[PDB]
Amino acid sequence: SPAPPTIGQVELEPFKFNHERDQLIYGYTMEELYGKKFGLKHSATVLREIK
Amino acid sequence: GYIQRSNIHEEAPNTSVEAKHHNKTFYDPILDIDEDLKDDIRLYGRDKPDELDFTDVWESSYQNIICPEYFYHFWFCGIVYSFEPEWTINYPFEKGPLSPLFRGEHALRRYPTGEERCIACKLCQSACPARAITIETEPRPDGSRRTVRYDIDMTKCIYCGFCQEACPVDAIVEGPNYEQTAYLHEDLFYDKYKLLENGDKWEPQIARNIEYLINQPL
Amino acid sequence: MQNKYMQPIQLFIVFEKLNSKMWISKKLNSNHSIALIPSNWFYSINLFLKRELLFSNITLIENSAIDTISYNLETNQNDLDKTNIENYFFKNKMLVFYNYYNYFLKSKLTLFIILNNLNKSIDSIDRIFANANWLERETSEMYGINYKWKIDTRKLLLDYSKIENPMLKEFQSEGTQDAFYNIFENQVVVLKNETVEL
Amino acid sequence: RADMAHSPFHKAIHDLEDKRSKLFPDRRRIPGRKAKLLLAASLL
Amino acid sequence: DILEFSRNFFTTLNEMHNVLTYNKIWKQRLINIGTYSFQTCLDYGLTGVMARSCGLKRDLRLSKTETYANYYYLNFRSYTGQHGDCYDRFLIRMNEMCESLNIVNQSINKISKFNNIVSINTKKNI
Amino acid sequence: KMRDLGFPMEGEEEEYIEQRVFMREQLPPLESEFWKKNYDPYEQDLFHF
Amino acid sequence: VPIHLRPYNKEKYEVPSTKLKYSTGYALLDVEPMPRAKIMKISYNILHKLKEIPETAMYRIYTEEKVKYIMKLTDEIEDVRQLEEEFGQDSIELFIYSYGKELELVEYMKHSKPWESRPGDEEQNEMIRIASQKRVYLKHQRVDRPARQEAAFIS
Amino acid sequence: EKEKRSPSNNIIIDEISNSDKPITKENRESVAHHVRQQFEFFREVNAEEVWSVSIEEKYNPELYIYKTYDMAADDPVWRQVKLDLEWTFENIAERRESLGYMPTFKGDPNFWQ
Amino acid sequence: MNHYWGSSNTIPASSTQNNNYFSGGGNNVTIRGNEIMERLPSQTPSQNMVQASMKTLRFYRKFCRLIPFILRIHNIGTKFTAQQAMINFGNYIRERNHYRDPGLIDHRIQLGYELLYEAEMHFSQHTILMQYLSPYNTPLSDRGYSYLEKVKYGNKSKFLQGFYKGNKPTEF
Ligand code: SF4
Ligand code: SF4
Fold first, then answer.
1. Are strands C107-115 and B189-190 parallel, antiparallel or unpaired?
2. Do the Cβ atoms of E37 and F19 come within 8 Å?
């Protein structure tokens, strides 16, 4: 019987902290795995008014 | 549940301008700007956006230094909300709006001839959820069946009106009176004299209300 | 009927040593299943329920007990068959029921346990479901149920310095004591009560 | 559908542009305007 | 009179809205207070507004097998939070009041007679 | 030890410390604990003393 | 070779996905970038943990069948959206959380032994059998007038 | 002959489902069949709810955002509700002003002869 | 010990010291604890009468140890001494001697611990909790007593005493 892969104790939790995420993403980055997170997407008129 | 439903998806109404029920100005470009704010990651959890910005910097600086909570809410509550006229009802000189169905002080009624309506059927006694009604009956020497005792503990009563609904001759009613405050616990032990005089005093208003209520089904 | 339904039969598949007795009724919701469970397997059954897939997303909705020692049919005594669940209310000293809801299967599950011992002893499940603490405390104080391996056994709703089970049929709704102020002691005391009767 | 656009259950469907303008704000808040204005004014 | 009450209740609810929702003190008093997730929300048998704040979609009116009293054949919205704290519960309660107004309006419409009889010529109401 | 357990390790994450220190329920006991024969508190056997 | 008897493939399952939800609908629940790999890991660990339960017990058989079903379904599906359309049309995070919960039941069932009988079973079965039976009533029973009680006389 | 089932059939009675496939310890394929059936039931029962479960909502959520002094102005539906209320009030007012009077119930002691 | 009776649940002697220096200590037996009780787990089941009797004896010992504290905090020391209160509660227990179901005895021990904790934390009223410490056939010590019915019904039996004094009101 092949040995099962190891599962971390803190793994299987509903959410993760920073070092837990660092454990999970050892080969990759946030953008490559989770995607892009956007704060606000102002329109052209709003951006022009802000400048 | 108990019927069939081949298509559970409720399709949206027709959006064509040709349609009779087309609703222009339903969507407002100035107001409906949710596409701007729907992609914010702050609305979905504890996470932070990939890039912060000077707009957030300016917002935080405005919130932390100017402290608008001391002028926004102060003005907008105080002045405007104080401009509105008052709501108070002057109780000694005005009364709050009631209805002919209002359940107040109990009374025993009479026929227009002066005869008691109550025939001691004890339906009101068994209808009482609080067991507040006690009735004892003897044949009156002329032969009619009348109560020798009919009393209600007003400290047991829950003022529910089940007894006036159960009465088949409209003998026991709940009147419009609510100013029945007493100084002794024994003043709230209502016997037949008290209920009879309550009926003899409040008969016009009770008659008017019952007249309207009777005419309602008709 | 007019909805997707399936029995919770895997529970008795895993627990191979148990008889299966289940009911569905139109007096209940169409997703509500009632089952009979022996008392000596209740803790293990709840352990299985709390963690097994498609059961783990479950919550305990209600808990209570029925004093069936005085249960009698009052009408239609000739319309009872061997399949009626009320047929299990006879000759049985006590009954206990638990009601759960499962979000994955969108189902209601009621479990019934027959207590036939005079001391009314059954294992507690408040170490599995955090609901069961107050619910089981109230049930134990109301019906005299003796819960074993419970987190908290203190009284929940009853008065201090009193031992009684008011929800038993033998108990009269007026109790046995009344509270009065005592002038000779300048404090409240309890006395044997005389009450009005209608 | 009473909760989506162009629903026959809705009654006020004809030209209510004036009422809609009167009852609702006609300008959009733009971030930073108050902050920049107040900070510059305070410094000056 | 119920429709009149609804129209004025919009204004009174907005009046309560603008002293609490955006208040810095209110936010610092309610945000991230009493936070819990769905696991606690299941362990302690939480239902209703608290269950909608923990993130769970649980409304008995909108359930297919558990609905009652005309609710299944109306059209209203229900709200769920994404943080499970006091602020979410407050906002959910305000939005539930608004949706209750909407449901009352829908019921009154369902017991209403809108169309009338028009003259055969000139399409004039009689 | 705290990092192995899963405690917050940053100032920003401390705002959710309770979610990792209190909101996780204790595991229920095994039924073998209930099936024991004796439940006396342990003490040293003083046979040779 | 069957998947459950096939060694865990790190490269096949630990692959980034380009189509993930912006968030789950639940508070304090994080989107898992690689859900299929986690499902395979938990399934293999469940099989290894079940290796200690007796093979003839229905708990082991039922769990092994369910695990095999889940493994086949998640191996045949490469898109997370169709996988989530299976398994209740909800967030896959809830499914993974509940399956991790399934992990501990193996240890909890060793000390409870659902495959072994208990001393109190017989009384429960007897009281089950007693409850269901025909229940006649004392009234509605025919009683005839008894014959005359003849008197006995001593000698 | 005495019972209606085979000695290997453990279904004493089944009125709920009228099943003809007993689950037995000996028959291991029945366990697999039950697992398949239960997973299919899971999918189907979650695929029939009209509000509780929606994968499209999970992937395309719709949010309500507080942005102005008016809570109703942040949602077109509430604005439509307010306009409908005003429309009903105006219709009632014009309909009642057209008639010019209002019948009322007046008390009559002749009712109490 | 994470329990209300744990050896570390004592009130500190001073604000900077649990006891004097060089050592620790505290009183948790004859007085109440420092922290409040938050849970009271079930009694471990007793398989026979010996375990139940041991539980009863230990509960009685705890009650006897806590008597003086209760008498002081409830201002009931003049009605009876500590020994008299112990004897009265022992009379209660003796009236409960005929019990033979160990589970019932465990339930009773749980209830007794609960009522004792209520008494020692001012949850109950002294005039209410004194019903378990009052004498059965003796007057209380804080007031005088009447011996009228002792003089008139001197040698008369119990039946005659209960016959001369009725069992119902006589007006009705
Ligand atoms: S219900 Fe009416 S008629 Fe009957 S006993 Fe009472 S008052 Fe009399
Ligand atoms: S109103 Fe209700 S509670 Fe009061 S006397 Fe009548 S029946 Fe009884």
1. unpaired
2. yes
